[PDB]
Ligand binder design. Structure first.
Ligand SMILES: *[C@@H]1O[C@H](CO)[C@@H](O[C@@H]2O[C@H](CO)[C@@H](O)[C@H](O)[C@H]2NC(C)=O)[C@H](O[C@@H]2O[C@@H](C)[C@@H](O)[C@@H](O)[C@@H]2O)[C@H]1NC(C)=O
Ligand SMILES: *[C@@H]1O[C@H](CO)[C@@H](O[C@@H]2O[C@H](CO)[C@@H](O)[C@H](O)[C@H]2NC(C)=O)[C@H](O[C@@H]2O[C@@H](C)[C@@H](O)[C@@H](O)[C@@H]2O)[C@H]1NC(C)=O
Ligand SMILES: *[C@@H]1O[C@H](CO)[C@@H](O[C@@H]2O[C@H](CO)[C@@H](O)[C@H](O)[C@H]2NC(C)=O)[C@H](O)[C@H]1NC(C)=O
Ligand code: NAG
Length: 257
């Protein structure tokens, strides 16, 4: 009924009990990923998430409350239950608040905050603590390609050698330029027809993505999906647009060697 994984989030760092202490009340933080026991989280059918035999616990259920480790039997029941939405949030059901890394740096302390679907609120429960590196193949079997910081992404004929067709799929639900991992696929607004470009990763809702079961790449805040504009590759414009199920919005990842 239980299984154990790392939890990877902002900038590819992991959820870590600060300094390996199991004392009740010790904050959770970001720290570079590893196998140490204070980064190994056991998910149970009672919706608890445990490390070193203690529970991930909201120290209060307010916006900005700290998340800590605490004895499972003595903590408040409402403070120790968590769900894991398919879009990569980690949510406390009682409060509706979500796990958030307010800064990218190692040693950032994790907080419960209002859900704004930010990349700083995206997490991946996994034993692979390295980003997955893949092509993203879409309309007409062409590949998504980055064309540098501040420019639009667009489709091109796939080629195994193009580094600008290689994407690092990070645990915080960002899609990064593999050769330049400080750069993020970013929608330039939350409205239909806004352009998708590459920008410096900043933890924003504009930089968070979800690969859903219909082949779409969804931006949770806008609700809108990746779309090759007007089904016209020659425009060299990828936008966000409502999900239509059409070929111009279908994508798959293909892992690279
Ligand atoms: C919940 O906590 C959040 C983090 O402190 C608040 O958002 C932050 O508000 C600050 C300004 O007072 C500022 O640091 C940031 O704009 C913002 N941070 C992020 C990433 O959201 C949030 O405050 C609300 O939302 C912000 C955007 C402002 O518009 C405030 O006026 C809002 O109150 C907190 N929510 C509540 C209910 O206070
Ligand atoms: C969580 O807090 C519990 C209540 O304070 C701890 O249980 C107590 O542990 C004592 C030995 O450490 C034991 O003599 C007490 O009778 C017991 N109280 C109860 C109600 O069980 C608990 O410690 C764990 O559970 C006990 C039963 C022993 O197996 C300990 O070795 C366990 O650590 C605390 N949990 C943790 C993980 O610290
Ligand atoms: C994606 O980028 C990564 C990170 O720069 C590349 O991985 C490095 O590859 C070199 C040579 O094989 C290794 O010595 C390093 O250890 C790697 N670094 C890390 C942090 O993993 C990788 O080659 C790129 N391309 C692919 C397809 O993954
Ligand atoms: C596609 O986009 C290109 C570039 O603007 C344009 O020349 C062409 O007419 C567009 N329409 C179609 C149907 O290809």
């Amino acid at each position: 009924t239980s299984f154990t994984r790392n939890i990877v989030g902002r900038d590819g760092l992991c959820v870590d009990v600060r300094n390996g202490y199991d004392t009740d009340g010790t904050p959770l933080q970001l720290w570079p990923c590893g196998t140490q026991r204070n980064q190994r989280w056991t998910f149970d059918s009672d919706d608890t998430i445990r490390s070193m035999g203690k529970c991930m616990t909201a120290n209060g259920l307010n916006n900005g409350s700290n998340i800590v480790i605490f004895n499972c039997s003595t903590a408040a029941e409402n403070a120790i239950k968590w769900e894991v939405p398919i879009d990569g949030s980690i949510i406390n059901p009682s409060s509706g608040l979500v796990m958030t890394a307010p800064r990218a740096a190692s040693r950032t302390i994790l907080l419960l905050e209002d859900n704004i679907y930010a990349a700083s609120q995206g997490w991946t429960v996994t034993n692979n603590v390295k980003p997955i590196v893949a092509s993203i193949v879409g309309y007409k079997e062409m590949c998504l390609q980055s064309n540098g910081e501040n420019n639009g992404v667009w489709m091109e004929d796939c080629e195994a050698t193009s580094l600008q067709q290689q994407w690092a799929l990070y645990g915080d639900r960002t899609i990064r330029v593999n050769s330049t991992r400080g750069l993020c696929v970013t929608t330039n607004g939350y409205n239909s027809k806004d352009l998708i470009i590459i920008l410096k990763c900043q933890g924003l809702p504009s930089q968070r993505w979800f690969f859903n079961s219909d082949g779409a790449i969804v931006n949770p805040k806008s609700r809108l999906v990746m779309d090759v504009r007007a089904s016209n590759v020659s425009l060299r414009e990828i936008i966000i647009f409502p999900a239509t199920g059409n070929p111009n919005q279908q994508w798959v990842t293909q892992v690279l060697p």
